[model samples]
Target: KKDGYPVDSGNCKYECLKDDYCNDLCLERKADKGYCYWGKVSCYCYGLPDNSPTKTSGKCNPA
Candidate 1:
């Protein structure tokens, strides 16, 4: 299944300082990938499953 809706990892404070912060946090939340988009303080995730265990908490193939 493919999910287009962006899920918030809800770990960032004020704003994400770096990509690694979102990467590690999102990964822990079970998201395929995460990043800090413009105008967003929280890390937004993509390609996460609808039934993800951390769905409440917050992919792709780019390595």
Candidate 2:
């Protein structure tokens, strides 16, 4: 099923519902790769040289 984003199950530092979602978003944003870091507090989308600034952070919401 295309959830319109990537999803993954893992113990993020903070708490992200979908890892793939972040990955897909980053990729779409032209990031060479993406990673969930700071306990998922932030999602870093890097460029080809892997030197782009971290430009995405996840916010916690009541679920």
Candidate closest to the true structure, highest lDDT: 1
Cα shift from native, residue 1, model 1 (Å): 6.2
Question: How many residue pairs clash in each candidate at the backbone level?
Answer: 3, 7
lDDT of 2 by residue, 1-63 (tens): 111212222322222356665566667646666655445354545552333322234332344
Task: For candidate 1, report its TM-score.
Answer: 0.46
Against the unseen true structure, what C-alpha lDDT does each candidate score?
0.49, 0.42
Candidate 1 RMSD to the correct structure: 9.7
**Which run of 10 residues does model 1 get worst, by summed lDDT?**
54-63
| Model 1 C-alpha lDDT per residue in residues 1-63, reported as the tens digit of each score | 232334334422323567777666666556677775446445555555666433243222222
| Candidate 2, poorest ten consecutive residues by summed lDDT | 1-10
lDDT of 1 at 33: 79
Tell me how far candidate 2 lies from the true structure as C-alpha RMSD in angstroms.
Answer: 10.4
